[PDB]
Amino acid sequence: QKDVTIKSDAPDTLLLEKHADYIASYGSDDYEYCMSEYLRMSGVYWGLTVMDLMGQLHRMNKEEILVFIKSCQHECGGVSASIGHDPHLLYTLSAVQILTLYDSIHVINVDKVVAYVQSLQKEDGSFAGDIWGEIDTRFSFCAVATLALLGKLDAINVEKAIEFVLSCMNFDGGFGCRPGSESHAGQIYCCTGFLAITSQLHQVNSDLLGWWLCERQLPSGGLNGRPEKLPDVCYSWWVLASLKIIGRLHWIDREKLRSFILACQDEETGGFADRPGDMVDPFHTLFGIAGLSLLGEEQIKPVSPVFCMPEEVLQRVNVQPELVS
Template sequence: MGELQVEKHVKYILAVEKRKDDFESVVMEHLRLNGVYWGLTTLDILGKLDAVDQDEVISWVMQCQHKDDIAGLQNEDGSFSGDMWGEVDTRFSYIAICSLALMRQLDKIDVGNAVKYIVSCKNVDGGFGCTPGAESHAGQIFCCVGALAITGSLHHVDKDLLGWWLCERQVKSGGLNGRPEKLPDVCYSWWVLSSLILIGRVHWIDKEKLAKFILDCQDKEKGGISDRPDDAVDVFHTYFGVAGLSLLEYPGLKPIDPAYALPVSVVNKVILGK
């Protein structure tokens, strides 16, 4: 099946973090905070979080905090806008619900209305879209199913129908795609797999073939994981590849929570105080 190149992936992530002034980093500045999340979570899953200066990271992240509160972005129909400009998407519903749950502040929003909006985005194929009537997509399905799981509302999901749609995302290579007739992509090793776990249908796919697909997407010389074998690596796919392997219980990796997309140890500490 191959072996996860742990040390090389750690070196790759640390090298990406140091390249703050090159062209690629500048044009992707709007995703830099996302990159911090992807990189740090990968390191934690690999058991290598001590490789970074945590005080420096915390200081930088705190500089990114905006004065507005998350709760102020909820709309009357229960949906959430991404920012002051008003774009609505179920991604923002998940982010709001997940973030507030981690801060133990879900009472700051209308949870019932938020759930009602998410359910309104459910389609006849069992999947979910970004807004009501929008096409089912594996990424949006995770956002909706994850949010419903966090709020204790998974009874709104047709688990067999959705499970069938999700398991059909596996292609011959073992990888998963996000929609019918699309190429497989390592990131769907998270979006699809986590959703299947949350609804109890993960046994409907070939987990061993999926693990092999992820491992085949590694740069075994320089580290990092790409979307497909032999493509350029990036920290986004490195995180989702490692997270997918964690869900598949790959040896030596910390378990990750399929709803919160964080190591189980972090979720337990933040929410349960353990």
């Protein structure tokens, strides 16, 4: 019953040139920017990815980011969000995703990235996020997403990895962080992505999970991350990408979702917000654009629902998981 009402002067056209400018300029002090240093690597992945999807990557600084990435690889092989920060699977994925957009994977020590990821797997097949032992199926995704882009999936115990993720499958067809955790969109995305990469989508109850996911669509057309929550562009990306992976994208109203996402654009400043009239950010701009791409927008490059990167990058490196259709 909770939902947003879209105001009737909301944006209803794709402001691509504005989003390009917003991202082209982002990180030129600034409050949220300096406060978001602990996630810089992923911010950089969000900006570069969305630019590349709009055909605008060349406007970003390749050389500069390549140097930055290299100085974020630690001696254990893991990559940190920023220089001086600690290595983590999240930023290891983001870095490997950036180097893949740039075809510069050997800017880092790939053998040591692999060894780092491999080191984080536990006896039950789960992955910790870093040396401090937090277990989350997000990290199961980060590990195999990373190893797949590197061609090193065989470096981990895949069957145990699979067993752990399926053990996080719930009554509703969804997935949680850890065994017994409740389903939600972000977690479902990670686990369905994981199962795409490991060739296990046959073990998903697509009809049951598909239904839970399409029930995320609210009358406004936006998708929420779980029952009794507000719709959101990020939740919308996760849910729709999950639906595509399991072959049920047609189970939501695509035109109503398109309108929700377009309405989250800022006509003045460019970029997308989490919901209409909120303040934009680069995170929701990637997901807005990626979502619209998945919904069939011909101006945006096709995006992988698994890696949230342009399909053409993935085709080039030859990593393209079979989906459910």
